[PDB]
RNA sequence: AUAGGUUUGGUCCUAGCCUUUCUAUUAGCUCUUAGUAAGAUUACACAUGCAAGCAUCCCCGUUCCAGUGAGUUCACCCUCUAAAUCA
């Protein structure tokens, strides 16, 4: 658990590292700020002009538990229990 | 066990006593419930003070008598509300007993109501899509004839004295089962004052 | 899918209806009245008080 | 992870994103697509992705599919009146097909808005009763009324034990 | 033909909208509310501007100004006055025609009094019932205590005037007495404390100007605009004052003399403005900044 | 409540009813009041029935309904 | 459910707690339980005065017209409510009761005046 | 005459539509034949006692 | 589940059983006293009180309500069309 926790966090790609890799602005959309386009990172190098192709159907492998809860199917009597502040 | 800050509960949190015991962390930062297991009970203790007797490990509020949960003590109240979501923590979150959490809840609402505590006030839309004032509800309704003449809306509302022959007819029918004849009723209730 | 026919129910149903016609009580039997107790002996019912006289 | 290729197709959010709600006339939809042939690429993508979306918004329409029965991919709709509607879909992307059938056999935005208004009228904000159907249950949940004897015991005057002690 | 221009006049609103301003940050300020993890998109420069353009337009809808209404006239109209019902009852009987289709304005709320008079309910009483039976989010049946003078002073001391207007707009109707009271009282605290910037880029700016123009108290607001290098906006404010008071010495004089720019401001500054010295002095410190740019 | 197979309590066997005494003044006035009252009601009820029957007819085969049907039918073709 | 005889009736469904009644105007059947199944709820009635001293009688008058137009009957207390509202004429017996009360109170002043005269 | 509330509503309907006619709206009670309460009813619709007294 | 304890001389991987959380019933020990909500284990026997009458005779009601959960895809939709209510 420790050696994996530190490994996952070590491969954590930053917003500017992303902007540089894709060469495009990384725009944050916050529901608490409406459609305000907050630019968190921009490519310091040359910016690109071709809109990244938006694939209508994303070929991402979802996790069943995530979708299970999203659709209100996970009813664990132990999840979201009142606990002391951490 | 009386507090000098009873009347000015805002002063304790400003004094150096507070700033030495707590500093910048909330008063509940160092409270750990004592409980069986790894998952705490979902309800905290009812009250830490029973008949002026303090329990073993008193909650944050009940271990310092100088902490008065008043709608005026805005600083204390702020500690028990999210600084990011504007929500009152649950009692298990901070460990304040059931008694104090309810008092706190009232205090939070009172300060918020009185304008002492800041909270998000959303921008709402108008109630009515159309503001036209052409409907009769706002216009003038033609008064009814009976209303104009101050008459009972329907004629049979008023008392109509029955004819003598008709009145006598029923006396024949209900012989031996008759009440005292009643004259015209008083127009205004003769309610004895 | 199919329901067991309630046969005895139907038998008694017809039987009862028929037997009522055969044993129809007459007006002289239904609407008789005892002028002493003021009660119809057929059903032992007391007529209303406002009809006694 | 979730099983299958493109697992998103098996999520309610994806199934509720269908924009083709057939009119009440449409009863049976048959899809005669080919499995191979570059020309029919759009036809099979429609069956892979959208038939799930169509059948969801239209749970009573019988969707039927046939592979390699004819040289050309084509749809056909059977309406209640008896009119059948051949939609040739060769050399046409799945999203184009999705919008074609929406145009010729889909409800307009006005019809959908009207249906949504009907649901609004079912839940009348004033109707008091179980929160499964209403907002409030009693009228003691309205501010400034007579509260329930549970939370705040009512004055002995109002209670039928001490006003009966005054009656008797 | 020429009629007293009302606020809703498109000519008028356009002016007031320009003066309001569109501070995107202020309109879409982060809120203190149940937060959810943000989202991210990779946007080309062109796409970023389109995200801005659609964000601009959305803010316009947000800053749409409440229509100023004249205080509603109390409804005092009876229907029946039966004397057989006098003394019979001890309580009122408010009858609300709850119906989904009826517009709240065009609703029938009648009351049977103990006296027996079948009246129509007061404007106040009506709104109470609309809420009881058609609860709106953010509206309360009992007047919140924050609207008391003691509590409003605290809200003003904290520079929370914009918030008070949102509470007042949600609780009370635009034509209610209570509404106008709070509406105007707020404008006063702002004027006395010179906090005209607090309400800028909000949907309440127009209502703020409309109040001041009708009281001939545009001085402070006009000064502020000049101090913030908003001459173009200041001129529009002076123009609006002229249109709403055509039969004035300054209004006709400017028309006859076609005064514009600095000349237009000075004439009103010396003649009518009660802070001419300060306005002239404002246009004199401005003169220093103008001289530097010219140099 | 009791069924028809349940007998009458021996206690209540002898129970004869008692005629409520009648005030001839109230009786006649109330009798006339009821007459007019129940007639105004019967008048109102019939009026609402016409409205209900009209709403069904107009929605089913009314001019506005028939135009919408043709509008959709013309659009369909 | 199918009842063996009955008609749609507009009645008051008794809710609330002990010593705290609250009625619900409901279009039900002539044979359904008082608090049982109903076809449609046509408003409510708070029989106890609120903080402002009034009785709160919401009435879905639009729908009341439709149900009466289909044959809906009305219970005695329901008729009297529409009277006090003004949708229907005042109930006949309502008036007769006021008269009886006033004639009882006529007797009362005769007796009460005597009490004050003595003491 | 119409009852209090109904009259107030009918008027507004006329006014709202655009009808300015102030003709007092009323009913047609003449059509309603108020039959006497003691009028002989149809015996054909009346029931009959069963052979069983119960 | 934010998990924890338990295989072994020990370590990993699997794995079951338990623990911590929330209810309801019954017991033990306690159980000052105010409101409200609920309250046979048993479709096994009952003391034998009380719960269907009202109405100028007919008619109408007593087939509803209130119970129980023994049996059990006859409860919801559609098509036809009864019996009621709409004088
Ligand atoms: S819940 Fe309202 S009376 Fe009890």
DSSP output for B109-168: HHHHHHT-S----PPPPPS-S-----STTTSPPPPPHHHHTT--SSGGGS--PPPHHHHH
The number of beta carbons lying within 10 Å of the beta carbon of residue F11 is: 7
Query: Whole-angstrom Cα distance, residue G42 to residue F51?
Result: 18
End-to-end alpha-carbon separation of chain B, Å?
Answer: 58
Q: In what order do the strands lie in the sheet with E109-112?
A: E78-81, E117-120, E109-112, E92-96, G54-59, G40-46, G20-29, G8-17, G73-74
Tokens representing residue D49 in the block: 């992705």
Whole-angstrom distance, CA of residue G38 vs CA of residue D131: 17
d(CA D107, CA D87): 17
Subunits next to D (3 or more Cβ pairs <8 Å) are A, E, G
Phi, psi of H5 (to 5 degrees): -65, -50
- Listed in order, strand segments (DSSP E) in E46-108 are 78-81, 92-96
Strand I bases contacted by the protein (CB, 7 Å): 1-4, 19-23, 34-37, 49-66, 73-74, 76, 82-87
Q: Residue G57: name the closest of G25, G14, G11 by CA.
A: G25
CA angle B159, B163, B164 (to 5 degrees): 125
Q: Hey, what are H38's tokens?
A: 């003691």
Query: What is the resolution of the experimental data for this entry, in Å?
Result: 2.4
CA distance F39 to H2: 13
Residue B14 to residues B5, B8, B19, B68, B118, Cα–Cα distance (Å): 11, 11, 7, 13, 20
- How many CB atoms sit inside 10 A of residue D38's CB? 7
d(CA G62, CA E249): 59
Strands D84-88 and E39-43 turn out to be unpaired
DSSP helix/strand/coil, E42: strand
Joined together, the tokens standing for residue C41 give: 């002996």
Question: What residue spans of A1-86 are helical by DSSP H?
Answer: 2-10, 15-22, 64-70
From the alpha carbon of G72, which nucleotide's C1' atom is closest? I85
Whole-angstrom distance, CA of residue B66 vs CA of residue D77:
79
C-alpha distances in Å from residue C31, one per residue of E231, E266, G100, H49:
108, 113, 41, 10
- Cα D33 from Cα D92, distance rounded (Å): 12
User: What distance, in Å, lies between the first and last C-alpha atoms of chain G?
Assistant: 66
In this structure, chain B runs to a length of: 193
DSSP symbol at B49:
B
Radius of gyration of chain B (CA): 35
Q: What is the phi/psi pair of residue D12, to 5°?
A: -60, -40
For residue E220 the two structure tokens come to 């402070």
Alpha-helix runs per DSSP H in chain F: 24-61, 63-76
Neighbours of chain E (3+ CB pairs under 8 A): A, B, D, G, H
Q: Can you give the distance from the CA of residue G14 to the C1' of nucleotide I38 in angstroms?
A: 19
Query: Atom of ligand 1 at shortest distance to CA of D137?
Result: 1
Nearest CA to CA, how far is F27 from chain G (Å)? 9
* Token digits of residue F42: 């019967």
Q: How far is Cα E189 from Cα E162, in angstroms, rounded to an integer?
A: 12
- In angstroms, rounded to a whole number, what is the distance separating the alpha carbons of residues F44 and E276? 73
Q: Across the beta sheet with D62-67, what order do the strands follow?
A: D62-67, D26-33, D74-79, D84-88
Cα atoms in the Cβ-side hemisphere of radius 13 Å centred on F11: 0
By the 10 Å C-beta count (0-12 exposed, 13-18 middle, 19+ buried), A16 is classed as: middle
Domain ranges of chain G: 1-115
The per-residue b/e assignment along D66-79, b for 16 or more CB within 10 angstroms, e otherwise, is: eeeeeeebbbebbb
User: Is the distance from CB of A24 to CB of E41 less than 8 angstroms?
Assistant: no
Min Cα distance G51 → chain D (Å) is: 5
Distance from the alpha carbon of residue D136 to the mean position of ligand 1, in angstroms: 10
Q: Indicate contact of E with C: 3+ CB pairs under 8 A.
A: no
Ligand 1 atom at minimum distance from G16 CA: 3
Using the mean position of ligand 1's atoms as its centre, give its distance from the Cα of residue G44 in Å: 14
**Quick check: helix, strand or coil at residue D73?**
coil
Query: What are the Cα distances from residue G112, in Å, to B188, E144, G103?
Result: 19, 48, 14
Chain F residues whose CB is inside 8 A of the C48 CB are 17
Distance (Å, rounded) from C-alpha E163 to C-alpha B120? 9
Contact yes or no for E66/E169 (Cβ under 8 A): yes
CA angle D26, D30, D33 (to 5 degrees): 145
């Amino acid at each position: 658990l420790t050696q994996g926790l530190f490994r996952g966090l070590s491969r954590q790609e930053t917003h500017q590292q992303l902007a540089d890799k894709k060469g495009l602005h990384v725009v944050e959309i916050r529901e608490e700020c409406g459609p305000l386009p907050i630019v968190v990172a921009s490519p310091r190098g040359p910016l690109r002009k071709d809109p990244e192709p938006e694939d209508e159907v994303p070929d991402v492998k979802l996790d069943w538990e995530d979708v299970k809860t999203a659709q209100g199917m996970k009813r664990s009597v132990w999840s979201n229990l009142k606990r002391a502040a951490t | 066990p009386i507090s000098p800050y009873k009347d000015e509960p805002w002063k304790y949190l400003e004094s150096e006593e507070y700033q030495e015991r707590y500093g910048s962390r909330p008063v509940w930062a160092d409270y750990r419930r004592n409980h069986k297991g790894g998952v705490p009970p979902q309800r905290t203790r009812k009250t830490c003070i029973r008949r002026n007797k303090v329990v073993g490990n008193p909650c944050p509020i009940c271990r310092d008598h100088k902490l008065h949960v008043d709608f005026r003590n805005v600083k204390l109240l702020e500690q028990f509300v999210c600084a990011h979501t504007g929500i009152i923590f649950y009692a298990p979150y901070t460990g304040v007993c059931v008694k104090q959490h309810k008092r706190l809840t009232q205090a939070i609402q009172k300060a918020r109501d009185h304008g002492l505590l800041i909270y998000h006030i959303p921008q709402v839309e108008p109630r009515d899509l159309d503001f036209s004032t052409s409907h009769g509800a706002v216009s003038a309704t033609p008064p009814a004839p009976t209303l104009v003449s101050g008459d009972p809306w329907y004629p049979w509302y008023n008392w109509k004295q029955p004819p003598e022959r008709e009145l006598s007819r029923l006396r024949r029918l209900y012989q031996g089962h008759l009440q005292e004849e009643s004259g015209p009723p008083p127009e205004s209730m003769p309610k004895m004052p | 899918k199919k329901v067991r026919p309630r046969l005895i129910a139907e038998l008694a149903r017809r039987v009862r209806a028929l037997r009522e016609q055969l044993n129809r009580p007459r007006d002289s039997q239904l609407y008789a009245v005892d002028y002493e107790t003021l009660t119809r002996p057929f059903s032992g019912r007391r007529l209303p008080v406002r009809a006694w006289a | 992870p979730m099983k299958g290729r493109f697992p998103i197709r098996r999520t309610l959010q994806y199934l509720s994103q269908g924009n083709v709600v057939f009119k009440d006339s449409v009863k049976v939809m048959t899809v005669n697509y080919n499995t191979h042939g570059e020309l029919g690429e759009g036809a099979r993508k429609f069956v892979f992705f959208n038939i799930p979306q169509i059948q969801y918004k239209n749970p009573w329409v019988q969707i039927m599919m046939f592979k390699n029965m004819t040289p050309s991919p084509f749809l056909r709709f059977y309406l209640d009146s008896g009119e059948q509607v051949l939609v040739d879909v060769e050399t046409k992307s799945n999203k184009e097909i999705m919008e074609h059938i929406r145009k010729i056999l889909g409800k307009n935005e006005e019809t959908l808005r009207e249906e949504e208004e009907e649901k609004k009228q079912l839940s009348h904000p004033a109707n008091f009763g179980p929160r499964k159907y209403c907002l409030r249950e009693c009228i003691c949940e309205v501010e400034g009324q007579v509260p329930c004897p549970s939370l705040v015991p009512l004055p002995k005057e109002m209670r039928g034990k001490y006003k009966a002690a005054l009656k008797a | 033909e020429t009629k007293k221009p009302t606020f809703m006049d498109e000519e008028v609103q356009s002016i007031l909208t320009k003066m309001t301003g569109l501070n995107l940050q202020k309109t879409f300020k982060p809120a203190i509310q149940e937060l959810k993890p943000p989202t991210y998109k990779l946007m080309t420069q062109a796409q970023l501007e389109e995200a801005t353009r659609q964000a601009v337009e959305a803010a316009k809808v947000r800053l749409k100004m409440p229509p100023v209404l004249e205080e509603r006239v109390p409804i005092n109209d009876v229907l029946a006055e039966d004397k057989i019902l006098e003394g019979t009852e001890t309580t009122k009987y408010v009858f609300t025609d709850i119906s989904y289709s009826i517009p709240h304005r065009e609703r029938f709320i009648v009351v049977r009094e103990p006296s027996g008079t079948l009246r129509k309910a007061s404007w106040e009483e009506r709104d109470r019932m609309i809420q009881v039976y058609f609860p709106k989010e953010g509206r309360k049946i009992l007047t919140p205590i924050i609207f008391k003078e003691e509590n409003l002073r605290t809200m003003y001391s904290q520079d929370r005037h914009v918030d008070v207007l949102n509470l007042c707009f949600a609780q009370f109707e635009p034509d209610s007495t209570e509404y106008i009271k709070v509406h105007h009282k707020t404008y006063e605290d702002i004027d006395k404390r010179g906090k005209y910037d607090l309400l800028r880029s909000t949907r309440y700016f127009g209502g703020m100007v409309w109040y001041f123009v009708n009281n001939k108290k545009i001085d402070g607001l006009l000064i502020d605009q000049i101090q913030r290098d908003l001459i173009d906006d200041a001129t529009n404010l002076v123009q609006l004052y002229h249109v709403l008071h055509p039969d004035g010495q300054s209004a006709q004089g400017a028309k006859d003399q076609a005064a514009e720019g600095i000349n237009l401001i000075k004439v009103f500054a010396k003649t009518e403005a009660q802070k001419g010295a300060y306005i002239e002095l404002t246009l004199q410190t401005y003169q220093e900044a103008l001289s530097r740019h010219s140099a | 409540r009791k069924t028809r197979h349940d007998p009458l309590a021996k206690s209540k066997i002898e129970r004869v009813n008692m005629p409520p005494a009648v005030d001839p003044a109230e009786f006649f006035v109330l009798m006339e009041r009821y007459q007019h009252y129940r007639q105004t009601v019967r008048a109102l009820r019939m009026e609402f029935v016409s409205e209900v029957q009209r709403k069904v007819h107009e929605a089913r085969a009314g001019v506005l309904a028939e135009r919408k049907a043709l509008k959709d039918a013309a659009e369909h073709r | 459910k199918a009842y063996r005889g009955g008609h749609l009736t507009i009645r008051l469904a008794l809710g609330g707690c002990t010593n705290r009644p609250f009625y619900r105007i409901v279009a039900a059947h002539n044979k359904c339980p008082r608090d049982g199944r109903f076809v449609e709820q046509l408003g409510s009635y708070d029989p106890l005065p609120n903080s402002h001293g009034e009785k709160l009688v919401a009435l879905n008058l639009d729908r009341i017209r439709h149900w009466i137009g289909c044959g809906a009957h009305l219970s005695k207390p329901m008729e009297k409510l529409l009277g006090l509202a003004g949708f229907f004429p005042l109930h006949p017996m309502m008036i007769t009761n006021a008269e009886r009360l006033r004639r009882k109170r006529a007797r009362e002043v005769l007796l009460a005046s005597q009490k004050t005269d003595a003491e | 005459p119409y009852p209090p509330l109904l009259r107030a509503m009918i008027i507004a309907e006329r006014q709202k539509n655009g009808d300015t006619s102030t003709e007092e709206p009323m009913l047609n009670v003449q059509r309603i034949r108020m039959e006497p309460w003691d009028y002989p009813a149809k015996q054909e619709d009346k029931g009959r006692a069963k052979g069983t007294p119960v």
